[PDB]
Design a protein around this ligand. Sequence first.
Ligand SMILES: C[C@@H](O)[C@H](N)C(=O)N[C@H]1[C@@H](O)[C@H](n2cnc3c(N)ncnc32)O[C@@H]1CO
Ligand SMILES: C[C@@H](O)[C@H](N)C(=O)N[C@H]1[C@@H](O)[C@H](n2cnc3c(N)ncnc32)O[C@@H]1CO
Ligand SMILES: [Cl-]
Ligand SMILES: [Cl-]
Ligand SMILES: [Mg+2]
Ligand SMILES: [Mg+2]
Lengths: 136, 136
Amino acid sequence: MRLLYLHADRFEYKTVKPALKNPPDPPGEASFGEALVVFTTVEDGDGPQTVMYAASDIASHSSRLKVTTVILYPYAHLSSRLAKPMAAHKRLIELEGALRTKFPGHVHRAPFGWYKSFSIACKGHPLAALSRSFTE
Amino acid sequence: MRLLYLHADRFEYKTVKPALKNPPDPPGEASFGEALVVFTTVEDGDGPQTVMYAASDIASHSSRLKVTTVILYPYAHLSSRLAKPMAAHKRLIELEGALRTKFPGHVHRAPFGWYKSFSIACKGHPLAALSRSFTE
Ligand SMILES: C[C@@H](O)[C@H](N)C(=O)N[C@H]1[C@@H](O)[C@H](n2cnc3c(N)ncnc32)O[C@@H]1CO
Ligand SMILES: C[C@@H](O)[C@H](N)C(=O)N[C@H]1[C@@H](O)[C@H](n2cnc3c(N)ncnc32)O[C@@H]1CO
Ligand SMILES: [Cl-]
Ligand SMILES: [Cl-]
Ligand SMILES: [Mg+2]
Ligand SMILES: [Mg+2]
């Protein structure tokens, strides 16, 4: 699993065209204020332990930043060892569930399988942009 | 070298605090309209051939998108095999020079060595977000 943690003053996205033959999530859009935006690339061989490590770390970092909103944003481009789309969607659903057991704030999982537009006002402070890897 | 190509309707950044003891570039800010924003992570062992491949590819993709502006945005977080900061700055300067020999539009190299805020209105079309790797 490869993640990019962006501490945003605002974030918003909108699904555009379907990227997969049949996106497993419906289309949509959302916007937010201060949040940790987590761009999330599921890698081959991510499993239950990977998901647990990521959930704990996301919760911890959110705690450090004193953010009370986390956006889980599926992203195919953070690495070159991607899991297949169905396994990736399953892991993202697990990640959302796991995060909710560790982080008391708002958790939004953005839709999987779409091309999406977004904008972000990414803060510029020292912890506003960090990358993470998780394995098992 | 690892790159993320984002086709933006707008982009803007502002240096915040210095990330390095002595950033080799002065502080600043800029904004833009439609552009290809290239987040750029220089990796260990990038050399002259890597720079040439990246310049050619950036030019080609820009040509496909019919963009006439390219932003070279130094980014430490796209991979886990970073070059050292001085070698990375040198390669980015080379990349900017090389790109100008292949791409007829505006080339902006953002400052190196700073924490930076940014916002982007990333388009949602199928080619609006792509990743690349170059080696030699
Ligand atoms: C493209 C850009 O605009 C958009 N934001 C996009 O990335 N869309 C992706 C993810 O939603 C998802 N996806 C497929 N595989 C993966 C994976 N292994 N990990 C995470 N997401 C995946 O399927 C879409 C196509 O790759
Ligand atoms: C942090 C985030 O806000 C900001 N945007 C940032 O990334 N700042 C980076 C790059 O400008 C640069 N830098 C250092 N090494 C590299 C490298 N190998 N490749 C590219 N840039 C590098 O040095 C700064 C600290 O890593
Ligand atoms: Cl980690
Ligand atoms: Cl390539
Ligand atoms: Mg819509
Ligand atoms: Mg300033």
